Amino acid sequence: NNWRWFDDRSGRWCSYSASNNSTIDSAWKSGETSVRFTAGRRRYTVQFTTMVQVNEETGNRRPVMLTLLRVPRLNK
Amino acid sequence: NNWRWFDDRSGRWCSYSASNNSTIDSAWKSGETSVRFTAGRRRYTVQFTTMVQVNEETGNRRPVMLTLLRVPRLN
Amino acid sequence: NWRWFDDRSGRWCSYSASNNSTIDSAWKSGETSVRFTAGRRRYTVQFTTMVQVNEETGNRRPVMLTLLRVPRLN
Amino acid sequence: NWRWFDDRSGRWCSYSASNNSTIDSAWKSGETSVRFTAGRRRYTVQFTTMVQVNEETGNRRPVMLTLLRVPRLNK
Ligand SMILES: Nc1ncnc2c1ncn2[C@@H]1O[C@H](COP(=O)(O)OP(=O)(O)OC[C@H]2O[C@H](O)[C@H](O)[C@@H]2O)[C@@H](O)[C@H]1O
Ligand SMILES: [Cl-]
Ligand SMILES: [Cl-]
Ligand SMILES: [Cl-]
Ligand SMILES: [Cl-]
Ligand SMILES: [Cl-]
């Protein structure tokens, strides 16, 4: 949905699974400074103070972004 | 609770109930141009293209806003 | 990019070009408030409550900041 | 207010004041992209993907726009 992480291999921003997006976005809305999530057993932490995702198995750091919708909304 | 409506009587922005905030925020995230909700004995439409809430019983209009959290977050 | 709500017309209204520039400059500088005048009336915008206040009467009208989509559409 | 991500250090990095101003001026004017130079390096920032492209090598560096809280907090 609205969070993305950048894949350096493909050179593209990528969406999370619905479940992981909801876990991240819920922690964002609750004021937490970081959040843990998994893809299967693979562990990750998103650090909101640096906007980086840390792969907790390889240590690789990928940037994250929060997409923003226009305000006000455009007419259809 | 990230949506707010302005109360001209008190001069303050006000929160929605958790459930009404969720209805509004779910329609916002889904790309809808407006959303209806019920609070007490009144039905309201939030018009996202104008950022105004309309009381459908009386026609009264109140402005709305979406709060935004800082990016990046502070330590 | 800044607007104030006019309850008489029931609509958000744009600020004048100069008032918009004055308000947006203070916003970007991290200030908590900014002064301006319109129609020979003195106002303060309070960014911590997102309202404009008539300094003589105390009347509060809400303000909003338009936001651009991120990413941008093609 | 604009930042680019450095995959070597794993950190977001600031632009020079002049390059930040070039990027932000194009952002505010509705452009879909903007070119800038830093020394011998030549880049395009693509706002539709939030990526900076090195015009010589094609290397992609993600970019971000910092966002100030609304409403603002008291000091
Ligand atoms: N940003 C603005 N830009 C242009 N016009 C504005 C703005 N803000 C308000 N106005 C207009 O400014 C006018 C006043 O709104 P207000 O400054 O809030 O103060 P009050 O409501 O206590 O009215 C104060 C006195 O003015 C009258 O004679 C009344 O009888 C009062 O005696 C409205 O027309 C607004 O649309
Ligand atoms: Cl990268
Ligand atoms: Cl990895
Ligand atoms: Cl009402
Ligand atoms: Cl004005
Ligand atoms: Cl590069």
Tokens standing for residue A65: 């972004």
- C65 in the Ramachandran plot: left (φ > 0), alpha (ψ -120 to 50) or beta? beta
Q: How far is B46 from chain A (nearest CA, A)?
A: 12
Atom of ligand 1 nearest to the CA of C54: 17
Question: Do B60 and C45 form a contact (C-beta atoms < 8 A)?
Answer: no
Alpha-carbon distance D60 to A9, whole Å? 10
Question: Residues near B20 by Cβ (< 8 Å), separated by ≥ 6?
Answer: B37, B38, B39
C-alpha pair distances (Å), D6 with each of A11, B5, D41, D60 = 13, 41, 15, 10
**Pairwise CB contact (< 8 Å): B75 & A33:** yes
C25: which residues sit within 8 A by CB, 6+ positions away? C34
Cα–Cα distance measured from residue D3 to residue D6, given in angstroms and rounded to the nearest whole number: 10
Instruction: Please give the number of the atom of ligand 1 that sits closest to the Cα of C9.
Output: 36
- Cβ neighbourhood burial of A74 (10 Å; 0-12, 13-18, 19+): exposed
Which residue in C has a C-alpha nearest to residue D67's C-alpha? C67
Report which of A69, B74, A30, B11 is spatially closest to residue D72, judged by C-alpha positions: B74
**Among D68, D72, D56, D59, which Cα is nearest to D4's?**
D59
State the total domains in chain D. 1
C45 with C63: CB under 8 angstroms? yes
Phi and psi for B25 in degrees, rounded to 5? -70, -35
Instruction: Tell me, in Å, the resolution of the deposited structure.
Output: 1.3
Residues in chain A: 76
Out of C61, C63, C64, give the residue to mutate to test ligand 1, the one with the largest number of ligand atoms within 8 Å of its CB. C61
CA-C57 nearest atom, ligand 1: 22
Query: Could you list the residue range(s) of the whole structural domain that residue D67 is in?
Result: 1-75
Strand order across the C41-46 sheet: C11-14, C2-6, C60-65, C51-54, C41-46, C33-38
Residue B56 backbone dihedrals phi, psi, to 5 degrees: -80, -15
- Those of residues 11-70 in B touching chain A at CB distance below 8 A are 28-29, 33, 48-51, 66, 69
For every residue of B18-59, DSSP letters joined together read HHHHHHHHHHHHTT-SEEEEEETTEEEEEETTTTEEEETTT-
Structure tokens at A1: 């949905």
- Tell me how the structure was determined: X-ray
SS3 D68: coil
Residue (of D33, D70, D69, D65) closest to D52 by Cα position: D33
Nearest C-alpha of chain B: how many angstroms from D57? 30
Contact yes or no for B65/B7 (Cβ under 8 A): no
DSSP string, C6-70: ETTTTEEEEPPHHHHHHHHHHHHTT-SEEEEEETTEEEEEETTTTEEEETTT--EEEEEE-B--B
Give the Cα separation of C45 and C4 in Å (integer).
10
| C50: closest CA of chain B, how far (Å) | 8
As a whole number of angstroms, the distance between CA B67 and CA B4 comes to 7
Distance CA C16, CA B75 (A): 37
Measured in residues, chain C has a length of 74
Look-up: residue for tokens 């619905």?
A: A18
Mutational test site, ligand 1, from C54, C56, C64, max ligand atoms within 8 Å of CB: C54
